[PDB]
């Protein structure tokens, strides 16, 4: 691979509703934004079927829950300005219409909940900055003007929040490497500057926070491993070295904390199926790769349910989405095999960053 | 102190509304119920003045986050049932009149909101068994019937959440041990049998999880001093032995979890002003207790503001609320000395129950 | 019990040979030194037999392998002095006659290893203070004079090293609480002054290190339930709070590493049979207590061989020694019950120190 | 680098003394080995002096401590066979001369003390086997005749034991992957097939235990950076995968293990000065490398001194000896600049193995 690669995507964007049932976003063959959620919050749940958002879309869709459980959904329309729709109310399938937040954008849209309970939008502009956009008002439709970062963005951003409140946002820059700037005071318009953390990376940043409060950042690296860093101290500017694991991957990572607090990563194998890696003990050694059976044609995106259990979507060879649970909520359960949530064929929505 | 003895309670419920300001519930001389919130999320802001709800009660108010964000209180009445009322809308100071829900209370009221997003209520009834009502969908006013789980309570009862959903709640029983019982799948009526964790307890029970996603239980015990004991496994039935620690404390205990992951308790002293310790590494040993300047009236109330700094709130021997807070979002932080919510004094209203 | 008592001690000494063979040293009903040791380091090993050194004797032995592999035996006389005598070399049956150290004691000796392989001895004096004298070259049969340390001791002494090399001691003081006393420098007559560790203690310190070069002290507590206290820095001043464990305890404990580096602890129980109890995790909770059959009249002596098995001996109802193993090299793993190392019986030659 | 590449060695063998003085052993350019020690065991203490043992050798020294404390080195002779002479009495400085113990020897000879005692010698022979021979008693210049353990070594073999007793060897395989053998039973000569942990090497492996009781090796991997991976169960078939370390490095790594239980590794880096990394917390991350000023010539050797500060030895531009330390026994302690040890010059005698 290339260093300026971008490794595969996830297809669908997930939520956990008010009632923590899961409900997937995902983009069709008439290129307009479908959804499907669980009757109730397990795994073995039935779903309600696809249902179609009107209107034609040009990026994949962000989706994150508003701080009075209304889910809300960020996708770059026609016009390539930035579009979102809503739930009228928690845990109902009554949505608005796409409303429109203009700029222009670049990228995939990344949605981060402020601490203050207000949403705020990252996105690589027309001049390939970070730009963003923020609720001025705890779940209301109110925003604010767009405003510049700056940078250079190669990759779609990944925004997390520290223990502290402070968001802190990751992308890949002109040169390769993986940068970040952060809020220097808890959701305030106050940001620091740019700063690289070295290392080229394949694929967009994934971010996760440990226990102890620290964020711990997953990226393909230049030679197709997995690779990842963290935080070290109680501030934004102390990480470790970077740290590879072996085993060739082939899509973006995706990263969960267990019931136990323990770290698992979901990629895609160079043999083309699922593998999964999981921290065996506390900050501890990471496990071989396992694999599950089947061919798989996305990157997995990973979600928890009501009692714990992870649930694994991908998309499948027949262009559907697929999906698989643990069986218990146990570190060491078993897990089922691939089942389809059949109804659309999906696609790749993905903005082309080159 | 003797061994049926519960220790003084906190003066206050706490809650966080969904854009995370706090919000105080107490009890007048009118024997109504007030209440007081940040007007920002962050601990040295204002205050927006002290509120009636019209209303005459006879327990101490509890008051828990509806999963859709809106702050809902339970009281018991001048008729001995359970009343509760609740915020219209999240982060709007607009509440219903309290409406009844009926049954016959014999302590303090508890509040759970379980992991399909449905609060439970947990009390002790006429006739000292432990029942309970539960919301029948998320964030909605529409409830079970009562139902009873049996026992013998002589403390009230603290419910938590285990890492994969299931309610479990604690409480003193007729031997004057501690008592647990629990649902044995997530969110379900569907419950074990009442099981002794033995040890004599002289205060309600404190449970906090920790980040291992382990239940661990403080209490104080039988020589006055705070005693704790914590899950072992991945189960309701695997618990460590008890440990004490010296240092003899005068009120129940209060415990949270820092954002470094460690536990903090906190308790008045024997010299009757607030104390605190605190794990000094993972799972660590225990710090000697270290005191604040000024005698306090009643157990610490303890919660985290929007940028995770912790904040303490008693009664005062003016019979008043004061509140002090950490001065940085910092495990080694200096704290602030006590200032005054001023407007009101309070009563305990607490449920007397021999 | 009351607060100047002192629990039950072991009935042996034990030490690892050059080659790991355990060998015990205990008093008979002639007031000599008698020992035993197996023939292989292994559990299941037959025992050599019971061989005596001629002389009476009026304390415990003390016993500890020079740096040279040679083991080394130390006893108060009926002189109420200080006597030794010493393998001529390592893993061999040949032994100096009893040599005079001179000095006036009045408790048991211990004797301590320093970093640069010159044994010290420490015991309380004449006048209750603490004494000390050392080997003036490692492994060699030249010692300094008679020092004293001060204080005022109620207990028989208990030395360690800190990871450093820093020798410190702990005993009970006149005011039956823990005190302790530390080299300032590594292996150097250079001292600090007493300090206190608050707490009253009924059974002479036990002191081990953790992994992470910490120093932890076990004791019998006032209420007769097991303490203990660990270092929380770098340095002997800075101590965590003291811990109890439910449970009565009724001799002296004794602690182990086992060979995953966790602690455990061993005691006679309320019961009067062998009680364990082991850290769950690191640093971690502890186990409940858990029982073997077996009435035992002395506390626990506490081993490991040369794989790694932990083996406990302690004294029986017939007046002989009595010893059980761990099956295999694994934390789980089952032990044998008592076997009996028959031949002689014993008495409890420990000093009255009041 | 090349796959079958062997990255640079240490120049000299260290040990510590009974009394734990630090003692090297190097070849000069006389091809003998010189040794010279401390005159106290403390890292600003004088050093005795170069002294020669006579007699021309073919190898890179090994030594290892008896366990009655006398040093014992071992060397390939000019007729290709293993050689070996000892301290006549621990702490002294009166050797044997070279005596025989035959074989034919085509690696350097790597030194392993069981835990009965009983020294045990491993190395490549004649057929590129692993053979070993064995003390047949403990501390005794008595010893068994060769045996093979077969396979196809491409590196030096590294021992250690396991936390139960058993011996483990490490070499690089045929295929240039690490691989491994293991006593079944602890100080016994019943070995495990042969088995592989996959992943090429480019440097002798490096053994070091954890506190866990888990051995962790680290090596140089094929992109010339550190990797590394540790036992995750109780037995020697269970591991972690590889994780490798950002930096390239150009010698073999060197580990040793702080006296807060934390492992440090040292290794020449891309810029020829010594780099040093160290885990950050318990099992956790990694450190970015630092650097010390000074070109240097061979790997790190690394040795602790009595009081637990950490040495290092190189060989320097001027191909005499080396060494830095850590001012205080303390993890973040700084470190002393480059002294000399000087009187000779020495050579790199390690064995070519292609």
């Given at each position: 691979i290339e260093n300026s690669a971008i490794a595969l995507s996830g297809i669908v964007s997930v939520a956990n509703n008010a009632d923590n049932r899961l409900e997937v976003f995902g983009v069709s063959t008439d290129s307009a934004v479908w959804h499907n959620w669980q009757?109730?919050?397990?795994?073995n749940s039935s779903w309600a079927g696809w249902n179609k958002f009107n209107g034609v879309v040009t990026s994949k869709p962000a989706v994150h829950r508003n701080s009075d459980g209304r889910l809300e959904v960020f996708v770059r329309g026609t016009d390539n300005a930035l579009w979102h729709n809503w739930q009228?109310?928690?845990?109902?399938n009554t949505w608005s219409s796409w409303q429109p937040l203009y700029g222009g954008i670049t990228s995939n849209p990344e949605v981060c909940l402020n601490s203050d309970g207000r949403l705020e939008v990252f996105v690589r502009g027309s001049d390939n900055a970070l730009w963003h956009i923020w609720q001025?008002?705890?779940?209301?439709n109110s925003w604010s003007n767009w405003k510049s970062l700056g940078g250079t963005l190669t990759s779609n951003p990944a925004a997390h929040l520290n223990a502290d409140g402070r968001i802190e946002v990751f992308a890949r820059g002109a040169d390769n490497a993986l940068w970040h700037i952060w809020q220097?005071?808890?959701?305030?318009?106050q940001w620091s500057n740019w700063q690289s953390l070295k290392s080229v990376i394949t694929s967009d940043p994934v971010v996760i926070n440990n226990c102890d409060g620290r964020l711990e950042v997953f990226a393909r690296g230049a030679d197709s491993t997995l690779r990842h860093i963290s935080q070290?101290?109680?501030?934004?500017?102390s990480w470790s070295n970077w740290q590879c694991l072996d085993g060739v991957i082939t899509s973006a990572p995706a990263a969960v904390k267990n019931i136990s607090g323990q770290l698992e990563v979901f990629a895609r194998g160079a043999d083309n199926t699922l593998w999964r890696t999981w921290q065996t003990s506390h900050n501890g050694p990471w496990s071989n790769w396992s694999s599950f059976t089947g061919i798989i044609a996305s990157a997995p995106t990973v979600a928890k349910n009501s009692d714990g259990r992870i649930e694994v979507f991908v998309l499948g060879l027949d262009k559907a989405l697929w999906h698989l649970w643990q069986t218990?909520?146990?570190?060491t359960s078993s897990w089922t095999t691939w089942a389809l949530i059949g109804g659309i064929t999906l696609i790749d929505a993905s903005v082309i960053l080159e």
């Open positions: 009757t109730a919050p397990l795994p009228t109310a928690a845990d109902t001025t008002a705890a779940h209301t220097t005071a808890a959701h305030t318009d070290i101290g109680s501030d934004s500017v218990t909520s146990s570190t």
